[PDB]
Symmetry: C2
Subunit: 379 residues, 2 copies
């Protein structure tokens, strides 16, 4: 058993004599799928993964400067030129300053001032385009066996995991002791970027990532940083020097901006997808088993889940293992309407068996064997 | 002779008092007959010692993470750390059942607290209109070779202006006393805030500073109680008993990027950008030195090639031969003998020390009368 007590839990019941069942999967939402004469299953979308993500850009967040060079001109002696202006690694700025006899020139006017610095990036993040072909959803399917350990165990070694990609959207999953289940999935959009920055991971929109005010480089191999002035600015000290100043690490700014995005290659908060379960090859274990004639004992007290279902963990006298569990629900006096666990069986005498049921509204009794459990499901 | 060759330069012309407007970056040249011409600039404005409106925190660290969890129908989770102000906390609800250690199915409370302590912060000081000190430099048009455009070393004299003593008497050596009545009058008195951050300083608006997304404390100096700590510490919830803390990190670069739009004030508590200031110069005590001096009779010669300033004026730097001291004769001829001078009394205090003279040449092919009879003449095509 799985997904019990999960807040976002949908109950999808298959139609009579339906070999298949439609299901909708989102992360944090699990679906309990039951079909007549077929095992009740719990389907959850465990995790999505993006493999071999293509590199879209590379933004710089922390920059450093060096080899500060400067050229200065007297008025009408040209405009200051430097060879560093020709280098893409260097960021530069020209300005005009008041020149006269006070600052070394013989003429009064506007003198040119060029300053270049050596733009190097020490710490940088990464943006990766995720293509539709590179998705790989992992869906866990857990059969309602009834073992005492797997109620909401949340472990992966209970059910079976199927990987589904847009390249291979359909897959046959072999559930042990229950056969083969075909799963036809149709993934939709889920144009978005994965921003690996200094060991973390985020998933943001493409436009939001491209409009980031950060120096960037294309994802192809000379590391020419565009819009370098976003990290390095130029303060005019006086007519013979324009000093460089660096803004510093924009990490904290990026964390502040990414607070709104969805955190995490494994990406949780998987996308909505619509899938179909063909169960023609699924086998319900214990269809053939004889009924139990022994007297049961309540191992664990009955508990009502969030959806009005109650779950019963019982134990057995023996002398009849294995067997089908005779389960019935009386009201107010009536007989059975609905059992969540498809086939309640006793694999071992010593192993308690869990069984989930939907009792009717108002006072009712749950008979197993003969054990009668009173219950009051608030109208 | 300060203020020469500075781009944004105003000329105010004359009795015994002149009205002037002072702006950082701008400067004025004041002239009056029988009174020495001066160069007045609003140097820098200093906030005396302002009061902290708000400290903000830009970097944060977390320790002593504590967590409490309760089963459904077992009440809300409680912690003694919720009583402490140093701890930032967050409470959530998680799905609980037989799978995560509870006997009942439902929503269980989960409370998590973390010790908020902060390594590096920035302060913000409200600049009350009272605690100001305008520094106004006044430089005399002497003509010495030292002060040609000397921004290198201060040569003039500076006056202090406060809203309590807006009037000041300054003594110009060999030139008497100058009375100065400025009116600060005033930038929305409590609008600006000085933002002291890790040795640097900025001036920003009050609303822009208050709307900054950063934790804040009352500015008084230990036991800093931080409000709005969630802006630097978030909580992610691992499943069913644990809520891990995430620190946003150093917001230094965020602050630098946000302050790129504001005007950097270059020093820690002095502002090298002032703002407008309306002043009145009273010269009833100002002495024009050189009015009893003799006319120069020797022949001059040009020390430095005539230079034109950006305002159309001409600067001429000459060396004298011998009365020493004496007054340099000066006027301009196109035909027209009249010529407007910027330097009021060009005198030669010493023979060796050259003398600079500023004049306003008339439009076109003028001539100059430095000297006498063998006084040198220079051509100038003012275009
Ligand atoms: C979760 O389950 C663990 C063991 O898993 C299952 O154990 C039995 C029921 C077998 O059916 C085996 O195939 C499974 O792997 C337990 O050790 C553990 O205590 C369980 N935890 C909780 C909270 O129920
Ligand atoms: C660059 O600066 C280093 C020291 O910072 C110096 O040793 C080197 O000679 C400089 N070279 C150039 C080309 O500027
Ligand atoms: C400016 O003042 C300094 C200080 O003595 C002086 O040495 C220099 O000659 C002056 N004139 C300049 C730099 O043009």
């Amino acid at each position: 058993m799985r997904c019990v007590g999960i807040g976002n839990r949908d109950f999808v019941e298959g139609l009579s004599g339906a070999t298949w069942v439609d299901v909708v999967l989102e992360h944090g939402s699990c679906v309990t799928t039951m079909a007549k004469n077929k095992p009740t299953l719990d389907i959850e979308l465990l995790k999505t993964e993006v493999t071999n993500p293509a590199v879209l850009r590379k933004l710089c967040i922390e920059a450093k400067i060096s080899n500060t060079t400067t050229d200065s001109r007297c008025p009408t002696q040209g405009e200051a030129t430097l060879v560093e202006e020709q280098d893409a690694n260097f960021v530069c700025r020209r300005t005009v300053v008041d020149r006269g006899w006070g600052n070394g020139c013989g003429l009064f006017g506007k003198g040119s001032l060029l300053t270049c610095a050596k733009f190097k990036c020490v710490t940088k993040l990464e943006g990766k385009i995720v293509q539709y072909e590179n998705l790989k959803y992992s869906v866990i399917v857990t059969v309602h066996t009834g073992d005492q350990h797997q109620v909401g165990n949340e472990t992966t070694e209970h059910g079976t995991i199927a990987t589904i990609t847009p390249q291979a959207p359909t897959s046959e999953i072999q559930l042990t002791d229950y056969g083969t289940l075909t799963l036809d999935c149709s993934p939709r959009t889920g144009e978005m970027v994965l921003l690996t920055m200094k060991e973390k991971s985020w998933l943001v929109h493409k436009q939001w990532f491209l409009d980031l005010p950060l120096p960037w480089t294309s994802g192809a191999s000379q590391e020419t940083w565009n819009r370098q002035d976003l990290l390095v600015t130029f303060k005019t000290a006086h007519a013979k020097k324009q000093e460089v100043v660096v803004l510093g690490s924009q990490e904290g700014a990026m964390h502040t901006a990414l607070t709104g995005a969805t955190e995490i290659t494994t990406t949780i908060f998987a996308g909505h997808l619509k899938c179909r379960l063909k169960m023609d090859k699924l086998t319900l274990k214990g269809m053939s088993y004889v009924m139990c004639t022994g007297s049961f004992k309540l191992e664990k007290e009955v508990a009502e889940t969030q959806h009005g279902t109650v779950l019963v963990q019982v134990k057995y006298e023996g002398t009849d293992a294995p067997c089908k569990i005779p389960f019935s629900t009386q009201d107010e006096v009536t007989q059975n309407g609905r059992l969540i666990t498809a086939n309640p069986i006793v694999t071992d005498k010593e192993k308690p068996v869990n069984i989930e049921t939907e009792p009717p509204f108002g006072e009712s009794y749950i008979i197993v064997g003969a054990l009668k459990l009173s219950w009051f499901k608030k109208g």
